[PDB]
Amino acid sequence: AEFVPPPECPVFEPSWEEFTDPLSFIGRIRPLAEKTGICKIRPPKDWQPPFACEVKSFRFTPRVQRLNELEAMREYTLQSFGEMADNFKSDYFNMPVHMVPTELVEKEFWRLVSSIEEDVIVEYGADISSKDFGSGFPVKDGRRKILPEEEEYALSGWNLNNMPVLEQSVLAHINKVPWLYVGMCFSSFCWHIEDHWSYSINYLHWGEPKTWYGVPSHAAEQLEEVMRELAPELFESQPDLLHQLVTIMNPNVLMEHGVPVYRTNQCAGEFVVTFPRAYHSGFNQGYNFAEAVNFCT
Ligand SMILES: CN1CCC[C@@H]1CCO[C@H](c1cc2nccc(C(=O)O)c2[nH]1)c1ccccc1Cl
Ligand SMILES: [Mn+2]
């Protein structure tokens, strides 16, 4: 009846030596991580970048998310979104936000997605460009002050602004930036893969965890087949890029049909990498702030 958590994906704790170059480290962990689709990477304890967005100006109108919309077939600052998000969660669970077990939010999320008796609606500050108010990482833009002790983070290969993003092509010889996600409890992203089957890297700057599910690329067609069988027939003929706007599916349904699924709780200061053609989806445990970019190898 209640949700059964998938097995945990790999977590890596690189030494300072291994942490020198992201692409080299990702290439070395690939034989394991590609078999789980997603992995988590914990930087060394002393690697702590400052938060570098323009907080005074940061304003956005999040999208509304009706958790049960398939089954059924306003403007905020960072501060005022946080107040709304914490009030929502503490009221929903009748306890302080940090006291709510991650497993309980997870079980309740999947219950609500399939419930026709209770219509829970949340908001997500999703797909906000780093160009609007800056990246959460420091950048040598000349647009914001960088303290000496922060320069190493502006120059780090793990700063998402410094990941390689240009794919090799003939058109490149003939002829972009990270996105931000301000989460609250139950805000979510449905199953998808990246454009061009790209890798992605995701960093949780601060706040409560982001819960992830991943499927390895060798099972991509299995997942697509389960979607074909069980996803709303009204949307069955839609191209993948549109279907993936609403590809909501409980991980246990995929697991029951033989699709390998792995989970993790990404906590503040931790990276999640998604491998090429690894389907993923997830939800936020509470008020948080993430940055993500597609990268090339
Ligand atoms: C146009 N393309 C095509 C592929 C996705 C990309 C657009 C961004 O799609 C959002 C998203 C993707 C994603 N991947 C990792 C983590 C998170 C996070 O929210 O933390 C993510 N959010 C998304 C997708 C579906 C439903 C809600 C939302 Cl918000
Ligand atoms: Mn993604």
Q: What is the CATH number of the domain that holds 59?
A: 2.60.120.650
Q: Which residue's CA is the closest to the ligand 1 atom numbered 19?
A: 189
d(CA 240, CA 215): 17
Closest listed ligand to the CA of 213? 1
Distance (angstroms) between ligand 1 centre and the Cα of 287 equals 17
Closest listed ligand to the CA of 294? 2
Q: Which residue's CA is the closest to the ligand 1 atom numbered 20?
A: 181
Q: Which residue's CA is the closest to the ligand 1 atom numbered 6?
A: 194
Strand (E) or helix (H) holding 229: helix 220-230
Torsion angles phi and psi, residue 20, rounded to 5: -60, -45
Q: Could you list the residue range(s) of the whole structural domain that residue 47 is in? A: 1-297
Query: Which residues, including other chains, have CB under 8 Å from residue 172's CB and lie 6 or more apart?
Result: 166
Tokens (6 digits) for 10 = 């790999």
Burial 268-297 (b: 16+ CB within 10 A, else e): eebbbbbbbbbbbbbbbbbbbbbbbbbbee
- Is 124 annotated as a binding-site member? yes
How far CA 63 is from CA of 75, 96, 136, 140, in Å, comes to 10, 25, 21, 31
Enumerate residues preceding breaks in the chain (C to N > 2.5 Å): 73, 175
Burial class (CB in 10 A: 0-12, 13-18, 19+), 150: middle
Q: Is 19 helix (H, G, I), strand (E, B) or coil?
A: helix
- Is 218 annotated as a binding-site member? no
Which atom of ligand 1 is found nearest the CA of 244?
25
Q: Which residue's CA is the closest to the ligand 1 atom numbered 4?
A: 194
Tokens (6 digits) for 172 = 């490149």
Give the residue from 199, 218, 212 showing the smallest Cα distance to 259.
Answer: 218
Ligand 1, pocket-test mutation among 189, 204, 288, most atoms within 8 A of CB: 189
- Resolution number, Å: 1.2
Q: Tokens 């930087």 appear where?
A: 43
Residues having CB within 6 Å of any atom of ligand 1: 124, 126-127, 181, 189-190, 192, 194-195, 202, 210, 290, 292
Strand (E) or helix (H) holding 251: helix 251-256
What single letter denotes the amino acid at residue 92?
Y
Distance (angstroms) between ligand 1 centre and the Cα of 51 equals 22
- Is 103 annotated as a binding-site member? no
What single letter denotes the amino acid at residue 86?
D
Closest listed ligand to the CA of 196? 1
What domain count does the chain have? Answer: 1
Tokens (6 digits) for 85 = 């998000």
Which atom of ligand 1 is found nearest the CA of 63?
29
Torsion angles phi and psi, residue 269, rounded to 5: 90, 0
- Measured in Å, how far apart are the chain's first and last C-alpha atoms? 42
- Residue pair 226/259 in contact by the 8 Å Cβ criterion: yes
